[PDB]
Amino acid sequence: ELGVFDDMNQAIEAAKEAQLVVKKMSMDQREKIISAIRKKTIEHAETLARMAVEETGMGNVGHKILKHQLVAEKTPGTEDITTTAWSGDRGLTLVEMGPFGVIGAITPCTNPSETIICNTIGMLAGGNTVVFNPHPAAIKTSNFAVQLINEASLSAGGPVNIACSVRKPTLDSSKIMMSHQDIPLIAATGGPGVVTAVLQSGKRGIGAGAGNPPVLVDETADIRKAAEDIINGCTFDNNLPCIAEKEVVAIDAIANELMNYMVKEQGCYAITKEQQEKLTNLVITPKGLNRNCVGKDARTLLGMIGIDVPSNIRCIIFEGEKEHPLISEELMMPILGIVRAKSFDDAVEKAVWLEHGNRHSAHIHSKNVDRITTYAKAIDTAILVKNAPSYAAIGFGGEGFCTFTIASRTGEGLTSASTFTKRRRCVMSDSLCIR
Amino acid sequence: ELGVFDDMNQAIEAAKEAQLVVKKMSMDQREKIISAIRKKTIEHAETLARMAVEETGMGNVGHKILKHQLVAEKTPGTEDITTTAWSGDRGLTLVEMGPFGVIGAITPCTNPSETIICNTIGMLAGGNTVVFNPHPAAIKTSNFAVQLINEASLSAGGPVNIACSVRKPTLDSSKIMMSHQDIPLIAATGGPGVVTAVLQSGKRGIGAGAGNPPVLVDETADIRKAAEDIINGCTFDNNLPCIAEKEVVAIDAIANELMNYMVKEQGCYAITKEQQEKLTNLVITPKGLNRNCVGKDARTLLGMIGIDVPSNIRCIIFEGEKEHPLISEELMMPILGIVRAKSFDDAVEKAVWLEHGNRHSAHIHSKNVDRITTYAKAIDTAILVKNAPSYAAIGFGGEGFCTFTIASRTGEGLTSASTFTKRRRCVMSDSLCIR
Ligand SMILES: NC(=O)c1ccc[n+]([C@@H]2O[C@H](COP(=O)([O-])OP(=O)(O)OC[C@H]3O[C@@H](n4cnc5c(N)ncnc54)[C@H](O)[C@@H]3O)[C@@H](O)[C@H]2O)c1
Ligand SMILES: NC(=O)c1ccc[n+]([C@@H]2O[C@H](COP(=O)([O-])OP(=O)(O)OC[C@H]3O[C@@H](n4cnc5c(N)ncnc54)[C@H](O)[C@@H]3O)[C@@H](O)[C@H]2O)c1
């Protein structure tokens, strides 16, 4: 398989060779390859989407098609690589974005191919190559994407091996990557474990970690639209996205109206206390999150505990306290608790607790500029969406570019080509200021 | 002593308290404190300069005064914290630079107070506070600077403890910093050891490591001025700066002219083979760089091996091969070998070897745009200065701002306030595009 190797040292050596060419390619040459990658991503979006759902059992095909189309359309390319200039009597000083070299990347089972293609487009734009250690549960989908990238590059005239991977990823192959002297940077997309591992590696690590995004709805919101947006955001790819709404904090005065719209118009099923207990018992196991429930749709999860609901149902909701395990924990399931708040200050406090200091994502429905400001300052997240579904944060119905690697822990935010470059100052003394 | 604590946990707790206030201060409020820090740095520059030379035995007072004046004048303040906006029918998306929190910093014995004051100005501007583990050989100078910063803040109305430190820094206090859960970021300014340690810490590390900066002089250069600039750059603060010229690669045709100007006009003393052997034996010990020679002036180093030279002498020079230990090693001494090159491609090769893949700093004297471009691409350094002394790279006679923390290893380049912030995207959906 193209770009795929039997062991991690081979993969890195191949990437290192390719990068000696990529670093000397024109922007127009990189951009021709990037353009081919975008094209083939759209052309094979259906195949990538169904492969991921088949292999992992998580998410859904239609939404994954939209995610791949988003990656293709809105991931930045070489235009993201920019230059500054300062000039005067003392000359001309430029600051440029140069390559790191061969970048290592550790990718998730939730958005396997999305992360690989997005990372690759950005890293290539800056003159790097990339080697992946994919999630072992999504290895076929991940390596198919690597194969596609290399096909796209060949169709543009090479080189081969701009993106490389391994046939069988292990913690051993990941340790080879994290101690390899030809890898100065690793981008980890996943949970707290992998982020910590990379930040202990002796290399710069970009840490894109976990979240538990609250959405606050106050009494000044468009409540009918808030119901639509929140359920749309929560249930997108069955709640796999790290940015998605995973619990609601609602001001008392509008909480009933909100929940009623959710049930009446947005395909939500309200579960009783008894049902909550049974669902909790299923989805949180003695060994943690039940991997056989992650990324499953609502009707399936309800069926698993013997609740037969019609197929118009796409989300499970209930009112509860913030400490309820289905509200406090990141489930990546279309299960959405509503926490009632007595006042806006109460609601902000509740939301801040629920975000658990991840500083990842949070959302609000409010039309009031002061309310928005207060929440935004307090919650201090890499992402904040106002009056839209969560997916507006990555360019799906919001201004701005797409990424699938949100560096919550290390502070680089929504990563793009510029993230994966080294800054270079060049001082031309006493010449080339033409003023 | 103000801002100084008996142990590292106390220091961090104090910094954490102060940061809850700093993060809510206006830019105008931070800038009033920064302005007071700049003022007191200038007012006490003579004291800081002489304290460092007295305590460490390295460098010289007059040059250290200029370095502190540079820090005060050209370190960026709150103007370095900037915002982007994208807007259209889908609304308004901002990207802001928010604080990390309490930043840890590990600082050198070469530029102790310069690094502390520069780091503090930048970190404060972004809403952070900072805790230092200074170099134990410069602890008095380092903590005097911390004391000055806190005095400056008090004079501006507080808070106290924006910059904190410890009475006695150890590897134990450094380990407390690197495992502390209230520290999400550490800025390490020093050699390969400390950079590696921070990149193993489980936190984001900004790694400002070692160099061995070559200066290439080709046959199109202004050779008389190249001699002046190179010796000025090399001998500044007795070659302590990490950016300073530490060896020359000279095209054959101009090498004699260059060296002759150095001897005749720039206070250089040309040492024989025999003298080279004796100097090597002194300055490189069985245990590595001789700490009793680092940062000493040329006349002193020559005296130490029994060579009496007049006091017009400020640099030791000789012609040699690139592998000569006084040419290949970063000495931080005004000892400057000249390596003769047969052709420009030869000269670039030699310079690239001499830089040792640090990707830190390199310099060139050439008036030819193609020659400059070829060298710049090949040497791939955070800093490149053309036709000036090295110190043009940090705003001393070149366009651009000052820093004392150049993140060669981790890629952030010349660090400033913006470096020490977390990126935050805020998506206001379907409103606040006024076009
Ligand atoms: N911030 C982001 O951009 C982002 C994007 C997608 C997913 N996520 C997060 O990731 C989680 C879901 O994805 P997942 O289950 O694939 O994540 P995961 O953390 O279980 O796995 C991600 C990758 O890290 C590897 N990994 C895990 N632990 C490791 C360790 N100790 N050492 C080395 N490698 C290790 C896995 O093999 C995989 O390749 C959720 O918490 C989600 O919020 C974050
Ligand atoms: N890139 C830059 O901005 C920059 C600036 C100044 C100095 N330097 C480099 O630093 C060196 C000279 O300074 P120095 O002798 O003070 O550097 P050093 O590396 O000996 O010490 C710097 C700091 O790191 C600490 N330290 C050293 N080893 C450590 C370890 N294993 N764990 C934890 N802490 C450790 C020291 O106590 C000190 O506070 C030169 O190589 C120079 O080029 C680089």
Author numbering:
A (entry chain A), B (entry chain A): 28 to 462
Please share excerpts from the published article on this structure:
Here, we study the kinetics and substrate specificity of an AldDH enzyme from the Clostridium phytofermentans fucose/rhamnose utilisation BMC, Cphy1178. The overall structure corresponds to other members in the aldehyde dehydrogenase family, with a catalytic domain (residues 238–427, highlighted pink), a cofactor-binding domain with the Rossman-fold type nucleotide binding architecture (residues 28–108, 127–237, and 428–447, highlighted grey), and an oligomerisation domain (residues 109–126 and 448–462, highlighted green). Cphy1178 forms a tetrameric quaternary structure generated by crystal symmetry, with molecules related by D2 symmetry.
To understand the co-factor binding properties of Cphy1178 we determined the structure of an N-terminal truncation, comprising residues 20–462, with bound NAD+ cofactor to 1.6 Å resolution. The ligand displayed excellent electron density and was refined to an occupancy of 0.83 in the final structure using phenix.refine. The adenine ring does not directly participate in any hydrogen bonding interactions, but is positioned between Leucine 198 and Valine 221. Glutamine 357 participates in hydrogen bonding interactions with O2 and O3 of the nicotinamide ribose. The nicotinamide ring is positioned next to the catalytic Cysteine 269 through hydrogen bonding interactions between N7 and O7 and the peptide backbone of Isoleucine 433. The two structures differ only in the position of the loop between residues 215 and 223, where P219, G220 and V221 are shifted toward the adenine ring in the NAD+-bound structure.
